[PDB]
Design a protein around this ligand. Sequence first.
Ligand SMILES: Nc1ncnc2c1ncn2[C@@H]1O[C@H](CSCC[C@H](N)C(=O)O)[C@@H](O)[C@H]1O
Ligand SMILES: Nc1ncnc2c1ncn2[C@@H]1O[C@H](CSCC[C@H](N)C(=O)O)[C@@H](O)[C@H]1O
Lengths: 236, 231
Amino acid sequence: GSHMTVHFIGAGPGAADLITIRGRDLIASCPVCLYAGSLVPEALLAHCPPGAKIVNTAPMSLDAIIDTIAEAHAAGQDVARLHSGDLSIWSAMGEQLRRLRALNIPYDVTPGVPSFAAAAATLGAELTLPGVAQSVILTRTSGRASAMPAGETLENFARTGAVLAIHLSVHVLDEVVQKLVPHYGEDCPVAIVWRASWPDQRVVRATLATLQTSLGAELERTALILVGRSLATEDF
Amino acid sequence: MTVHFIGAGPGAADLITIRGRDLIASCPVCLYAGSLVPEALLAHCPPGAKIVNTAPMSLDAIIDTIAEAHAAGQDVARLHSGDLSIWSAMGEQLRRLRALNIPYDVTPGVPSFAAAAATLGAELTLPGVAQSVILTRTSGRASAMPAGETLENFARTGAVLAIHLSVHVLDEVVQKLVPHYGEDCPVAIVWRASWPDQRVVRATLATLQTLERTALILVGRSLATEDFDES
Ligand SMILES: Nc1ncnc2c1ncn2[C@@H]1O[C@H](CSCC[C@H](N)C(=O)O)[C@@H](O)[C@H]1O
Ligand SMILES: Nc1ncnc2c1ncn2[C@@H]1O[C@H](CSCC[C@H](N)C(=O)O)[C@@H](O)[C@H]1O
């Protein structure tokens, strides 16, 4: 047989049917499910086996989360640990792994559909365009929410001319365009996708100079900003 | 009818989305981009489905085959490796389908850099270390890169790099990055993530020793460090 394992699973961008097959099958097979708040679609939780311990981690500290996993480990019970999107980017999986290694609790990771992919799909767009863009930068702004390492400034990324997929930043929409106009041009295409794949999904396309900045301060913060020529060109 | 562009995922049959599998099961016609789309997914095609490998085909022939399905009112499952947003050549197909008024939609998939990070058990962004991931490639005698998109310019940011389509020029990648990232900078290469013959190498830029081409290069401190903050 196999021993108790914590299965980190990328739940995808919000639609229950955008989890992987593997992701859903692991949910179906774990007696304990820990899900990272309402950004994990509740319909996924219907896959938990009958009698599962289902735990919303959004009100919990990292310590409480780790203690709960340690309890599952002590009981020999597999855990389905669900995070929105994919695990590789801004998931806070890393800090959990470090704690699990220190406790010798085994884990594995099942990749998900990241939100920039959901957003591109919503737009019906290939981001890479021969002769226009051959790179995509996944980034964020400090946005009064983080320190960025020194070299990770919008200015330094903007200098490459790559497609930018800017996360965690819709509340600072106005600063973003101010910092990007000098590099990309006033007329550079920009697209914002709120809540990609949710019943709630909303899109705005414009150029940097013509984007309605006040859209950012609105209630919904789950939005991805895409910037670059390849968002609105057929010249490729 | 509708042409369903679908991100097949990194290769394992179970790393397609539920939606993607369901769309495949409901399409009388399936167009798949080569053996980089695992054959097990083709088992999901409905009985008597016309299944077509597009790898041997020109864009004109692909669009013809689609226009045929459209004239026959038959939905098309159009499979590409990984996700569609990056180096899929989905774009040129949509440009042609628009010019013909053929309806399409896009189902996102798991990109290979995500599958690679997952096999490594790694979160790429780590507070106080790296808050950005650059998905890129090299010219590598296979492309022209826009002028701003050099390894040099990217390396200047100190971001994590997920370098695609570049394993044939690993030597030159290493030499360009060392000056910026350091000789001791952790690096990992994942060949064929999620496939049965998946191979993983973890090293540093200096100690990585320079033939499958389906490989992803990942570079950065966050690949092997526990000195980071909570979020
Ligand atoms: N369904 C969705 N639609 C649009 N943007 C989304 C989204 N889900 C997450 N995001 C973006 O991701 C940020 C949260 S950080 C978590 C990102 C997630 N791990 C991923 O793989 O994408 C949000 O601020 C927003 O910029
Ligand atoms: N299973 C896999 N393992 C490692 N790298 C892979 C892979 N599948 C694709 N790649 C990478 O992607 C390149 C092909 S370009 C297609 C990328 C795909 N659309 C995606 O979403 O990732 C290859 O050169 C390789 O770098």
